[PDB]
Amino acid sequence: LPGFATRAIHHGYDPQDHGGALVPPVYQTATFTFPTVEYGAACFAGEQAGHFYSRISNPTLNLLEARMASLEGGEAGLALASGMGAITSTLWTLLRPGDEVLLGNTLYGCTFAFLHHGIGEFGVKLRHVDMADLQALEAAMTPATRVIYFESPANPNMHMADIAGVAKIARKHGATVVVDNTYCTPYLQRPLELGADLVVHSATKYLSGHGDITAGIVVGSQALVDRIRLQGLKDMTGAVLSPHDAALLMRGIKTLNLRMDRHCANAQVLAEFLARQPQVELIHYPGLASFPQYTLARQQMSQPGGMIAFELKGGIGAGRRFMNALQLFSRAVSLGDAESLASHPASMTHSSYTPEERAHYGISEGLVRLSVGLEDIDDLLADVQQALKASA
Amino acid sequence: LPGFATRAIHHGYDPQDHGGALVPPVYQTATFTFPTVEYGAACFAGEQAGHFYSRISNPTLNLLEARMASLEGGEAGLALASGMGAITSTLWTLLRPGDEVLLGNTLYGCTFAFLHHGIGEFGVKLRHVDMADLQALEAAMTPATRVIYFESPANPNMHMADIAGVAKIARKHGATVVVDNTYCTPYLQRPLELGADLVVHSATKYLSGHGDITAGIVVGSQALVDRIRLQGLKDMTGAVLSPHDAALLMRGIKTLNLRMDRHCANAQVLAEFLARQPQVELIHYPGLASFPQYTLARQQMSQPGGMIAFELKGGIGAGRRFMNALQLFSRAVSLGDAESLASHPASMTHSSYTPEERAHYGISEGLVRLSVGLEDIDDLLADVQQALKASA
Amino acid sequence: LPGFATRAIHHGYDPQDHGGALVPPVYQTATFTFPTVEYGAACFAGEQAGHFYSRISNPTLNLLEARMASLEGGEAGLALASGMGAITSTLWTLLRPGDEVLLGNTLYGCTFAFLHHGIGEFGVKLRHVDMADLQALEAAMTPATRVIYFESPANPNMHMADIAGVAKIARKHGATVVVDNTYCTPYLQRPLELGADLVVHSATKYLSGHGDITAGIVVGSQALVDRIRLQGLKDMTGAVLSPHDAALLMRGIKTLNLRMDRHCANAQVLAEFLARQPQVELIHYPGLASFPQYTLARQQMSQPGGMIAFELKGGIGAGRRFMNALQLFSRAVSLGDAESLASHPASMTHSSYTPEERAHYGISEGLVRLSVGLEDIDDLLADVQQALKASA
Amino acid sequence: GSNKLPGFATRAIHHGYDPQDHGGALVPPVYQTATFTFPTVEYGAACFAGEQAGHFYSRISNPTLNLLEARMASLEGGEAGLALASGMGAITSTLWTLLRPGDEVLLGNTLYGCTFAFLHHGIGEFGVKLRHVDMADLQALEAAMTPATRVIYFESPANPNMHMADIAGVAKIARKHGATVVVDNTYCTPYLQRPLELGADLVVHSATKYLSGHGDITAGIVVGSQALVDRIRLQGLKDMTGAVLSPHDAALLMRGIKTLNLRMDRHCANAQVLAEFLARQPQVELIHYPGLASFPQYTLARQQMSQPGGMIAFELKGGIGAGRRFMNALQLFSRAVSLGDAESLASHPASMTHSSYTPEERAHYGISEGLVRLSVGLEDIDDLLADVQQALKASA
Ligand SMILES: CSC/C=C(/NCc1c(COP(=O)(O)O)cnc(C)c1O)C(=O)O
């Protein structure tokens, strides 16, 4: 097996099948023609290998899918119009009324809304559990539990789950484990190699790396991915990725290892800085020895990532003023871009929650989240220092 | 009030607001920054204009949306990753368990599959009514009836619905009427002006015109579109259109009127030709007097369209020989491209129906569907001529 | 031999050669690899047929080139980064110091600048001559004359050249005739079929049709085009066209016929309107019976085009008022877009600053030129009408 | 305080763009438009003159291209930038504006093939005189200067043999005599070498190579003084080449420049390990890599380039015959021209990038027949070593 960087650049592509083109040509085409109608009819049956319509399958997208599967260590992949496209296409195809889903305690806002105000209003039972407390997860398992879905680390407090420990319990009771691996990427964490069945990404984030597309990835077994493609995507969401955006995603993926290395090194220095500052009340960063689940972090992630969450002593007022004072960091949702970003999740990413749900599921009101970018670390520190003075 | 072609080129855009740029700049960006966090909070709350995240809203998508709303005569538009994106996003937000939806007799494969094997399996009631028969429709209206959905003309037999007749009934019972206007386009038929509440398009087809993007549009009232954007798209499908694809779609729309004229002219000559041939049992083209619903087609559609359906005497076997001998037409699914396409809906586009579930909903044995393109008519006649000779 | 529109959609491409893709895939790639190095050495020698570097040759560019060659009735085509790309690459290849180039009396501004302040200052002789007047052209020929270069119609006064008469005179001295066919496009005029050796285009204009790319085309004999590719383009200009832009150009070419029909019908109407107005001293439009070269225009052009130039009685000040009053027409240089455009070169384009510094070649004082777009003619008429009233 | 210059990486991501000026878009929107319009026709008069700041036509200037231009200027440490359709578009647009019949250009001993061909068979045939000089030999350069000498033009390291020039030294001689110094900086990028900071007047790039980094576009850049870059914009590009960069391709180039520092770091680290491995090998006659002490101009490399780069040049014992068999055995490296891509490439200049040269012009101007050039990519170094190791086995 070649190394991660070699596969992120080369896997699934030989230039000699495409006129020698070093870069794969872009199949910006909705439909594909047939030499005979029996050949075309065989394609629709699955009996012959080929393409007919890009919503179902497209060669540019397939190469992206194969490459991402290789990177996650899984069998098959599916590319979609957004991260929400990944999650919704996936869960619509795996759940039906009366099924129960076990959720991580804290979730990305639109995932939470999808579950509670979307598929949960169509007869699917939901129950939130602390996926780091394996006793409690075991106790919450019923025979109607079909899916355990969580993020590790969680957006946005960085709460972790023991993935292999959860997978053990799901094997024991017969549930499908679905992990949102957006924050880490396959470069830092591979939930399929720890017993998960499916992983989902917002490829909008680190995998793209440059903030210029919206996209989603699903990786897992050929059996599960084929059902998500032919039902979730085809019929229930229609979240088709543009070949153009798929080509850019592949372009971004070729520097993933180099980007994550720099994201992680910048974030480590910044986290250590913030931990020594008088205005900071507390800080969640997996790379800090004070991180509650530091041991599990080093067990599961090869590096501590580029995301930091912290609270300021002065509460929401100080957080507002910290944020307005930033000149190099931009005030924006999203993450995993070259540009450093900051946000207040209660008023933004986690707006979809009520005040009561945020307090119950762990989204504080004075919390700020930083996506640490690829800028020079001295420039980012100088920006942060002066914003802390301004926060008071 | 400027004419249709004028609005298809200019509506919603003044070059003076974007540094004089004649063509609108492409906002290929996932996220948008805020000058203060208060500004950002306000964007999420809805109480101020601007942008935050392209899955919810993007200025390039907004121009397309506003422009499509003008063409259709609606208050608001929404752009999505595909036709199925538009349909599913619309229906996932309007319906809940115990609601009923009355459908047209014939539907596009994946719409049918979505309805019966997707949302239908989540506690929603389906019932199929002839939407030309107002007596039957009235007798199907239960107080659970929340939505009325149909194509007119229908894919692929060309069945018309009485849009003003249906809307009359729906206004009395408080039902929302949704019309898939893909085949006609706003240039030929505007269902909102005949009383529909929402129109959906596969913009993949005539609106793009060139077969290079997959895309969907929803147009209707502000209040319905706002709900479909903020629930269906945001939370339940994530069917986000690429700004790149939206700029290609806007580019296509700029020649819609000229393209539709030529599609219609070419298809008229070809339909009239196919009527006169001995190998043809029947034919469904709205611009022949022979067409069963000719009078209703003239009241809704300003021209008869680019699509022909027909049967050969010889049946399924003669279909194969005809299709396989076409040398200018291509054997492929889809429609509304510059290139002329030929399709066998049983094995291809309507494969999602079981054998003789096709026959319950009017999908014949030896039905060949043509999407007539923009090529020189004499070349299209010659090609069809020699193909009929080879089907003997 | 298939019709013009059929060739503009299909020529040189079969979907069976590229996985069935209806639309050709875009080779957005700088380099191409070789299976062995003997294969690679052959490619640079010209022995083996393949690809090595997009600046020299790219499959996406080749398809565009073959298609543009088919439309103009030429052996071969070359795609370049702009119309000036095409013109400069052509002339740098064909001329050396001491060679003379014979020039149409009026020329596009940058072509004039290139000839006079560029290649003319490297020892190449220039002479301007009326290319309608065969007596003076024959008298102007010298042994040094190697190239005869002109536009017909000539920007911006619509003056015409006798292409077949010029070619006949060129054949007697072995000189190469190069026609800028930008205004007409191959749909309206085909200078190669009237005896010219090479045609050049700003494909930026009508061929694109939508104002979103800059591109040049050269079409002519294989031997000439090979040399412009391997000398002009490769070494002397580096005016490489992006494959992405070449894909868009081909997308524009698919509606060239329909767009040109509409451009011309709109311009005929606006010309007939302006010819009768009291504010209008003089008008140049090939379709008007009063047009000085009406008979010659109709020998060479199948339709009279989308461009109009006219003179207002009030001179420079009236020109400004008219231009400033247009609400629908945009004040811009360029032509051939869906959007209607107006320029008033006496508010300074064609590079010159006073009366008498003007009018060596026919650029005047109250001359405004219109690129008549694809909008509804009643809207265009209304806009021109109110602008005429404001000009008084 | 605030008068400190931001770091290279910060400027490669941010310089010249505030999201506030474009509806908050984090990524600049792409101006894929040929033409721009005016609010009045007097405002239009001033934009072809140059009293008013603004836009009219993309072949002259465009907001997406201006951002790219200003950003590359910042990185090179020059006043202004220009974006063109290719490396050759940058070179030709520059030389067509600076030279006229009677002028002499002093040229580095070895040049990229199409640059050589442009000079000898192109602009040379239009009355411009040419002289080659070893630009590492400052005494020879001084001796070669004449009062008709107008431009000094060279690459450093040169394509394909890695020969170098003392840029600071050439600039000093040029200051004294009055010539304009133009350096093709393709190989190093502004991350490794900044010829304007050493005294050059203009730098040109094939941005097709490391700046893009991903092999999907063709593109050129010129950076220099405002006066010289304006002249090149309005004469070379506008009238003499028309080598206009697509705004789409300029957006991709900017996307690539955001990872230039990281990619270059990894190119150099990979090539260094690979060069040391090739130095130890029995099949290898010689090897030119600037990071080995055996490199003829080792101290000059160290003095001008902050890292040794991604390009290796070597020769096998067995000559051209052994080249053939080695290159045909590679399975991770690709056989192709170009360089500075994520994918590792191997080529053979005499039949490839330098085919424009005649056989005696290759022996003269330092281009051997058995020379094999490597552009070391971003793959895992153990995968690359293994591929080169098994390829040397089959070349025996
Ligand atoms: C409320 S707007 C902020 C969007 C952000 N996140 C998105 C996201 C998605 C969904 O992915 P798209 O569908 O690609 O966004 C899925 N999974 C995770 C862990 C995510 O963080 C944000 O973090 O700020």
Ligand SMILES: CSC/C=C(/NCc1c(COP(=O)(O)O)cnc(C)c1O)C(=O)O
């Ligand atoms: C025979 S095709 C090989 C392409 C290679 N070279 C490119 C190049 C250019 C020209 O730049 P575009 O015009 O952008 O290619 C200019 N200047 C330098 C120092 C270059 O290396 C090659 O080395 O293999």
Ligand SMILES: CSC/C=C(\NCc1c(COP(=O)(O)O)cnc(C)c1O)C(=O)O
């Ligand atoms: C399985 S092959 C599909 C190609 C065909 N139709 C699609 C279609 C859609 C769906 O739209 P996307 O989601 O944009 O394809 C919606 N509405 C209508 C009337 C449609 O015809 C076809 O061959 O008729």
Ligand code: MET
């Ligand atoms: C730099 S002058 C540009 C003029 C414009 N391209 C025209 O067609 O007239």
